Amino acid sequence: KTSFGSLKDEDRIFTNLYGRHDWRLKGALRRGDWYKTKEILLKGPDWILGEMKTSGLRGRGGAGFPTGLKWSFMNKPSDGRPKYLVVNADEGEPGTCKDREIMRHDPHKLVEGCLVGGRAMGARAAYIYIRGEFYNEASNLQVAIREAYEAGLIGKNACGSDYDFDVFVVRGAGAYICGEETALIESIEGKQGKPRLKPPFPADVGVFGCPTTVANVETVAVSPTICRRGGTWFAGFGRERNSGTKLFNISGHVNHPCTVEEEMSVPLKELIEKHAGGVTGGWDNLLAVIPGGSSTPLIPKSVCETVLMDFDALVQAQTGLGTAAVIVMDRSTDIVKAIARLIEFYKHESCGQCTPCREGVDWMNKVMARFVKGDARPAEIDSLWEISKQIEGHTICALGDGAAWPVQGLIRHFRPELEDRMQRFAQQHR
Amino acid sequence: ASATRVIQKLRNWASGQDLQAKLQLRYQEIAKRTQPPPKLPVGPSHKLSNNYYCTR
Numbered sequence: 001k002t003s004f005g006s007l008k009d010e011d012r013i014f015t016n017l018y019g020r021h022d023w024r025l026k027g028a029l030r031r032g033d034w035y036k037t038k039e040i041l042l043k044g045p046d047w048i049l050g051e052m053k054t055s056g057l058r059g060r061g062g063a064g065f066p067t068g069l070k071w072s073f074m075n076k077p078s079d080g081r082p083k084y085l086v087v088n089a090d091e092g093e094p095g096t097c098k099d100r101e102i103m104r105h106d107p108h109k110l111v112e113g114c115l116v117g118g119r120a121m122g123a124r125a126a127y128i129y130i131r132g133e134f135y136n137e138a139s140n141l142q143v144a145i146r147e148a149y150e151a152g153l154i155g156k157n158a159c160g161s162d163y164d165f166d167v168f169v170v171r172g173a174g175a176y177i178c179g180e181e182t183a184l185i186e187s188i189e190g191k192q193g194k195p196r197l198k199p200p201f202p203a204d205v206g207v208f209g210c211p212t213t214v215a216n217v218e219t220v221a222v223s224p225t226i227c228r229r230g231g232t233w234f235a236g237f238g239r240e241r242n243s244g245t246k247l248f249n250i251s252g253h254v255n256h257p258c259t260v261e262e263e264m265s266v267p268l269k270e271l272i273e274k275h276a277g278g279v280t281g282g283w284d285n286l287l288a289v290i291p292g293g294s295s296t297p298l299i300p301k302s303v304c305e306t307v308l309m310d311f312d313a314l315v316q317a318q319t320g321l322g323t324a325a326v327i328v329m330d331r332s333t334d335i336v337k338a339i340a341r342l343i344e345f346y347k348h349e350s351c352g353q354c355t356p357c358r359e360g361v362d363w364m365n366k367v368m369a370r371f372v373k374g375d376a377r378p379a380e381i382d383s384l385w386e387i388s389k390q391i392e393g394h395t396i397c398a399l400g401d402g403a404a405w406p407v408q409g410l411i412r413h414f415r416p417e418l419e420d421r422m423q424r425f426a427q428q429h430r
Numbered sequence: 431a432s433a434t435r436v437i438q439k440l441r442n443w444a445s446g447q448d449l450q451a452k453l454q455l456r457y458q459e460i461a462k463r464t465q466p467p468p469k470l471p472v473g474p475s476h477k478l479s480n481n482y483y484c485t486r
């Protein structure tokens with residue numbers, strides 16, 4: 001295949017994305033969840049890991065690290081310690097609502113994925129760390145978990161496969177950094193949401209000091225459909241090394257902002273003009289797109305003309321595919337104000353543990369506010385670029401990288417806009 | 431500078447040099463003791479980028 005898109009509804013995984021059917025156990029059984037999962041668990045961990053590897057699924061969390069290898073990091077004999085699967089339901093990143101939608105509309109897919117991943121790695125429990133603001137989503141998840149426990153799919157006999165598994169749901173208390181892997185592990189452990197360094201990796205020392213694996217809700221939920229339908233089908237969808245389906249949250253200056261399920265490698269223009277109803281005012285009215293959530297930098301319309309939605313495609317476009325959050329900004333957008341609002345978000349959500357992110361993101365917030373006002377001189381653009389480069393790669397977690405990247409994208413693309421604002425300010429004072 | 435012409439001619443003849451052209455006593459040609467405030471320039475390292483200390 002050379003052209004990607006036009007995903008069929010018979011091939012879409014999240015068949016109840018829009019909540020038009022019952023989200024409870026009866027509706028999930030009608031839609032096909034919890035089918036032959038006992039047979040999957042009896043076929044066991046190595047077969048599921050091989051299925052994930054031949055599916056070639058990458059992490060939906062952000063980084064995109066190969067899920068098969070990441071889950072095979074825990075394919076070890078136990079050293080007397082329990083092993084844990086953790087689900088990252090935080091969804092702190094702006095532009096993103098897909099995990100919220102699938103938690104509140106297809107929760108049994110999440111529970112079955114927790115069971116499948118826990119058996120595939122060897123585990124007694126899956127802790128779903130949900131965002132604290134998602135109270136109704138957490139309650140729906142607990143209702144689905146109670147339904148599964150009553151039906152016997154979870155707990156002391158995993159669908160009659162002589163496997164023991166428990167699924168817990170633990171709520172956060174309002175921190176975007178608690179969506180990070182190690183900070184999420186610490187938040188479950190009961191401390192502040194401060195990320196811990198690697199090594200040790202969570203596959204060796206993780207939650208409570210056990211081998212553990214933190215995985216995205218979308219990854220976990222598409223795991224049992226991958227197991228049922230085979231890895232060859234999922235790998236056949238998408239391009240090479242960027243395979244399968246993806247939930248895209250298109251928001252901003254579009255006619256119909258929405259969450260849709262689409263095949264990977266779809267053109268951005270095709271995706272927007274097909275599912276979002278197009279840019280408000282038109283594709284000529286489009287100015288910029290942030291394609292993978294606020295961690296990824298912006299790209300202007302000229303490169304949005306023919307860009308694809310792959311990890312590799314956005315890397316070649318000097319961006320990344322994060323949470324597949326497409327934020328659209330038209331000609332009426334104050335682009336510097338939008339980027340400064342993102343940097344202010346990162347200033348409010350940095351945990352402050354480590355010096356480069358803490359001090360430098362506060363510094364970037366102040367410099368970006370002065371850039372919005374126009375209150376500087378154009379050498380500060382290169383100064384801010386150097387500050388962002390100092391932040392990036394020197395931090396404990398990747399929040400410093402995700403705060404340095406939008407500044408880098410704005411400086412890379414919309415530098416004459418900054419310079420025009422700055423000289424306008426200079427001439428209207430002098 | 432207050433010398434009369436007779437004494438000036440006597441001094442010039444007696445020394446062989448034009449003395450009134452180059453007087454060793456400063457009268458008015460020197461700079462004012464009160465000066466306008468200066469603004470000293472900055473060096474080459476006063477820049478906000480490409481100024482890492484390991485490169486210099």
Ligand SMILES: Cc1cc2nc3c(=O)[nH]c(=O)nc-3n(C[C@H](O)[C@H](O)[C@H](O)COP(=O)(O)O)c2cc1C
Pocket residue numbers: 058059060061062063064065067070088089090091092093176177178179180181214215216217219397398399402
């Ligand atoms: C500051 C920060 C916030 C993050 N927030 C989330 C989040 O809310 N949800 C998520 O699934 N991943 C989030 N991630 C990415 C996690 O590292 C990743 O999801 C986790 O390691 C699971 O990997 P996966 O993508 O293979 O599932 C965040 C990362 C960083 C640096």
Ligand code: SF4
Pocket residue numbers: 177194195349350351352353354355357358395396397398399400
């Ligand atoms: S990069 Fe920022 S959010 Fe991450 S550990 Fe450092 S201070 Fe905390």
